[PDB]
Design a protein around this nucleic acid. Structure first.
Ligand SMILES: [Mg+2]
Ligand SMILES: [Mg+2]
Ligand SMILES: [Mg+2]
Ligand SMILES: [Mg+2]
Ligand SMILES: [Mg+2]
Ligand SMILES: [Mg+2]
Ligand SMILES: [Mg+2]
Ligand SMILES: [Mg+2]
Ligand SMILES: [Mg+2]
Ligand SMILES: [Zn+2]
Lengths: 50, 86, 94, 148, 94, 67, 49, 37, 177, 120
RNA sequence: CCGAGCCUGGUGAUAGCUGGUUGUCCAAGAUAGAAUCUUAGUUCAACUUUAAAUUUGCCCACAGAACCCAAAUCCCCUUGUAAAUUUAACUGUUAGUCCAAAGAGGAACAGCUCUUUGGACACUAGGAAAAAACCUUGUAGAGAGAGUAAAAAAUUUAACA
């Protein structure tokens, strides 16, 4: 997980976009999302997500 | 279409924005006399002068604030000098 | 066959909309514009204490102009000419 | 409404633009009342600048009736015979003047919808398009899949 | 006169005969008519293109419902081209 | 013309051409109607406009040898 | 105007199509090598001021 | 509906676009690391 | 130009008889192009009010090929009108019964859903084999090309191509093959 | 629930390659931000829309000048997603009183003090 | 046509209840809640409107705002901008739906119900199939001019010494 989040070629990551609030996405998002960035949705957990 | 190309080249994305296709006069007398300016170009140019005057005043006020900070720092320097001279 | 329960866009069960590369490209464009916006927002030109007390003068003149325009409220002027020009309707050639 | 209203193709009278331009407003006939607050505008117009109008436009002809009328009218006919009646009842002098000037500028053809904002009697150059313009020919003219 | 072309004002008869007469006045051979393109020959709307060629060179092409209409129209085209009344000619100067 | 043409970048030179056009008539356009209507709200409004229009005729076009 | 031109004078529209095809080929040469080459002659642009 | 649900609660379209753009782009060389090396 | 008005109009808005061969082509592309030509979009004078269509004829619909397993996947469905008349026939059986129905209905779907659809479908023509009535292999204009290529077979590949093509690997001798 | 989002200041800390790619010299920085509204003010909170109203950008695709100072950069950060911004460029120095009229903008964020309106 | 007749008069009985409510054009304009034999209503507050007097009004910079046992918030000079308060006169709204988020009830069901922050709708336009509530987008006209916005789902699956 750590090496994938280090080596991903995506210049755009949920943590960056959320901490930036670059399209008012804090609207659709929750404050819990700041720590539940991409992996979590309710009770589920997608480990492949980054 | 092509607006991105026009932008990368330096022209307006919309040809109606600025350039020779829109700023030039649309008609002149058959004798070669100059036509009066049209209202669209007149208002655009007035807006441009307002914009430029605004830029000038903004820059002048920023420079004045910077210079005032410099003067105030010099005041502080000379008044500390006064203090330790006392 | 092929029915959706209730309304098509709301509720516990709805029609699942999906993403298209068109929208993906659009949003990456928006956010890269926003990234260069962040960059240019960085590196300010002046500091707080530098920019503290420069525009208060202009703001003061603006607000006093507004006060003057607001206080300038009265009836308009009335004139003998404007009153008596109503007499011009009954004219006729002699 | 366009479909309720008739239409015409854009055209000019007698091709006025090619040769010498001619003011194709032929006649004006004003009908005004001596009395009546409604005719004050027409009376002051005749006082000030109907003279200047006629002097500026010698080709046009002007008649004035000056007879009792509850409403002042202006009648105008053109070269084609196109009639134009207008009521200047309770109308200011500057707008009356603009009205007369626009009638002088106007031509002898009734105002209706124009299908096309232009007209070209010589539209086509290099030959009008037909399906066979942009495709080659065949050796001694053979249709596809034909021996002789 | 600007608008309408020649043969709306000045009607003629035997345009191909007049054409051969004119060509022999100009001292050239009598050209032959040849269908260049055709479509729907059996169809209720026959369509032919006739060209008038002298010495293996063309002068005028003309469309037509049938071969006769096409060849007479091509003759008319040749007449217009010879007399210089082509619709694409110099407009009247002023 | 029949056998050639001249493109601009964007527009051709001034003295290269000379397009003369004469004005022939000024008139009010035939009355165009604009109304806005809404449903079950008694929102209905009408207005009539007569836009001005001018007609020109292009007299002649000529080309200069200045290339 | 592109429409009515292609209608009434197809030779000019064919000229425009050839122009466009050549500009496509110039753009492909540029996609191959952007700089380090002589830019296309028709791809050249005019600078206004 | 509630935040946590038994089923996967369908999310807002903006959020689903964001999640569809944000993925692990695996860093691959131009050449596969078996045939050539 | 220097043409007469009525002949010019006639030649301009005249119809054209296009031909195509259906030997190993996709009915999708064939119907797309046939719809373009029937509508008359290829004519730059196109507008819906004037029926500027053109007649199209296709040959050898029997020798048509789909892409994919569509011969089995696809299901042409129609209701006769009575209860239990909701019949379905795969493309294969529908072709065995009528080899043209596929292409004609494909174009029926391609074309707009106005009443002009039926007229343009009437103008269309169809032949499962390389044989035509005299009138309508006479009154033709042009045979435009096919959308796709036809891959060659081993019996079709000449020897010089095989020789120019380099061999890739060396087998060991000890192998039954 | 939805609230005003605080931005960590670490977001606005340029990197070396960021400088190298944007060509923005941190030393001798610009003075003025040209700004234009790209996003709808609808479906946006009252504070965002009234803040852009205060800045005076009710009209879209209208380049408008603001200062480069923290008090304004605050609002710019608040409504950053709604706007395309770029610093001011000028080679020809400030517009002189004689050239007040022959001014023109460029898509590259530059301001020409003279406008001859013909090619080189 | 008798749970108690028909006729006349009071009587134009009353009805928070249903319905209806006539010419043109323009502008501003849905907005916390409390009490009520009160929840189909009304009164006050708030919002909205009109005309005036006055000056500060919105955003907000450091600092500041609890022991118990997170997103944010209040105040807040500067700066960006031009609104706000007060005075005088009323009316009307005061039975509200979805979405995102923080929670409760319920079955961690509801196109369910209830509070809070926000948005849209009950105003026009484009798109997602038709679509209120989803995404783009608002100040209004004539155009047979142009550049963009959001805007089209991708998937096929298991041999073994
Ligand atoms: Mg339903
Ligand atoms: Mg929720
Ligand atoms: Mg009773
Ligand atoms: Mg009553
Ligand atoms: Mg009640
Ligand atoms: Mg309004
Ligand atoms: Mg304050
Ligand atoms: Mg509900
Ligand atoms: Mg509910
Ligand atoms: Zn390999």
């Amino acid at each position: 997980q750590e090496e994938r989040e280090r080596n991903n070629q995506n210049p755009w990551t949920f943590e960056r976009i959320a901490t930036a609030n670059m399209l008012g996405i804090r609207k659709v998002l929750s404050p819990y999302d700041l720590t539940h960035k991409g992996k979590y949705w309710g009770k589920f957990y997608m480990p492949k997500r980054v | 279409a092509g607006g991105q190309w026009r932008l990368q080249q330096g022209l307006a994305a919309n040809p109606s924005g600025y350039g020779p296709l829109t700023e030039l006069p649309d008609w002149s007398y058959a004798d070669g006399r100059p036509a009066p300016p049209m209202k669209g170009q007149l208002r655009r140019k007035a807006e441009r002068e307002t914009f430029a005057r605004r830029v000038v005043l903004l820059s002048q006020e920023m420079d004045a604030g910077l210079q005032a900070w410099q003067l105030r720092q010099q005041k502080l320097q000379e008044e500390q000098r006064k203090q330790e001279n006392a | 066959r092929g029915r959706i329960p209730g309304r098509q866009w709301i509720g516990k069960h709805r029609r699942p909309r999906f993403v298209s590369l068109r929208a993906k490209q659009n949003m990456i464009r928006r956010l890269e514009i926003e990234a260069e916006n962040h960059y240019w927002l960085s590196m300010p030109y002046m500091t707080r204490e530098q920019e503290r007390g420069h525009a208060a003068v202009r703001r003061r003149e603006a607000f006093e102009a507004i006060k003057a325009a607001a206080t300038s409220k009265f009836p308009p002027h009335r004139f003998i000419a404007d009153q008596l020009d109503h007499l011009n309707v009954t004219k006729k050639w002699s | 409404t366009a479909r309720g209203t008739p239409s015409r193709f854009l055209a000019s009278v007698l091709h006025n633009g090619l040769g010498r331009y001619v003011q194709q407003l032929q006649r004006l006939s004003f009908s005004v009342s001596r009395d009546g607050a409604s005719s004050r505008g027409a009376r002051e117009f005749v006082e000030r600048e109907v003279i200047d109008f006629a002097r500026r436009n010698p080709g046009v002809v002007i008649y004035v009736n000056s007879r009792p009328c509850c409403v002042p009218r202006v009648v105008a006919e053109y070269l084609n015979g196109a009639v134009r009646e207008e009521s200047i009842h309770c109308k200011s002098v500057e707008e009356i003047s603009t009205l007369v000037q626009k009638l002088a500028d106007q031509s002898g053809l009734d105002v209706i919808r124009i299908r096309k904002p232009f007209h070209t009697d010589n539209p086509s150059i290099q030959g009008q398009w037909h399906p066979f313009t942009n495709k080659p020919t065949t050796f001694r003219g053979l249709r596809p899949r034909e021996v002789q | 006169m600007t608008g309408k072309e020649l043969f709306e004002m000045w009607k003629i008869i035997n345009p191909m005969g007049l054409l051969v007469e004119e060509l022999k006045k100009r001292n050239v051979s009598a050209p032959e008519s040849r269908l260049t393109r055709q479509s729907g020959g059996t169809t209720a709307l026959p369509l032919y293109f006739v060209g008038l060629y002298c010495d293996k060179k063309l002068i005028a092409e003309g469309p037509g419902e049938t071969v006769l209409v096409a060849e007479e129209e091509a003759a008319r085209v040749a007449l217009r081209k010879l007399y210089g009344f082509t619709e694409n000619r110099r407009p009247w100067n002023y | 013309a029949d056998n050639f043409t001249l493109l601009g970048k964007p527009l051709l030179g001034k003295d290269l051409v000379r397009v003369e056009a004469t004005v022939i008539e000024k008139t009010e356009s035939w009355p165009r109607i604009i109304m806005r209507f809404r449903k079950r709200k008694n929102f209905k409004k009408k207005r009539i406009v007569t836009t001005p229009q001018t007609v020109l005729r292009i007299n002649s076009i000529e080309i200069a040898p200045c290339l | 105007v592109l429409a009515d031109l292609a209608i009434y004078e197809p030779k000019t529209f064919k000229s425009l199509a050839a122009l466009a095809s050549r500009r496509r080929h110039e753009g492909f040469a540029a996609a191959l090598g952007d700089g380090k080459e002589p830019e296309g002659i028709f791809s050249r642009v005019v600078q206004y001021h | 509906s509630k935040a946590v649900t038994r089923h996967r609660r369908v999310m807002h379209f903006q959020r689903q676009k964001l999640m569809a753009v944000t993925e692990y782009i695996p860093p691959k060389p131009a050449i596969h690391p078996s045939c050539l090396p | 130009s220097s043409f007469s008005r009525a002949p010019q109009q006639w030649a301009t808005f005249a119809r054209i008889w296009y031909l195509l061969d259906g030997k190993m082509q996709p009915p999708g592309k064939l119907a797309a192009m046939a719809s373009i030509r029937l509508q008359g979009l290829h004519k730059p004078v196109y507008h819906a009010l004037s029926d500027c269509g053109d007649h199209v004829v296709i040959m050898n619909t029997r020798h048509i090929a789909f892409s994919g397993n569509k011969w089995e996947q696809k299901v042409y469905s129609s209701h006769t009108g009575y209860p239990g008349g909701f019949r379905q026939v795969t493309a294969a059986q529908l072709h065995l019964r009528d080899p043209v129905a596929i292409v004609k209905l494909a174009i029926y779907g391609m074309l707009p859903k106005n009443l002009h659809r039926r007229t343009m479908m009437e103008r269309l023509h169809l032949f499962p084999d390389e044989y035509i009535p005299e009138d309508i292999l006479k009154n033709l204009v042009e045979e435009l090309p096919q959308p796709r290529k036809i891959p060659k077979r081993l019996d079709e590949y000449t020897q010089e191509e095989i020789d120019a093509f380099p061999r890739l690997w060396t087998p060991p001798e000890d192998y039954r093959l | 629930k939805f609230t005003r989002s605080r931005i960590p200041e670490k977001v606005f800390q340029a990197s070396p390659e960021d400088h190298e790619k944007y060509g923005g010299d941190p030393q001798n920085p610009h003075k003025l931000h040209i700004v234009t509204r790209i996003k709808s003010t609808r479906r946006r909170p009252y504070w965002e829309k009234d803040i852009i109203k205060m800045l005076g950008l009710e009209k879209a695709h209208t380049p408008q000048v603001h200062k480069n100072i923290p008090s304004v950069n605050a609002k710019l950060k608040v409504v950053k997603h709604l706007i395309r911004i770029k610093p001011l460029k000028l080679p020809q120095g400030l517009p002189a009183e004689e050239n007040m009229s022959n001014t023109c903008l460029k898509s590259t964020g530059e301001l020409v003090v003279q406008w001859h309106l013909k090619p080189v």
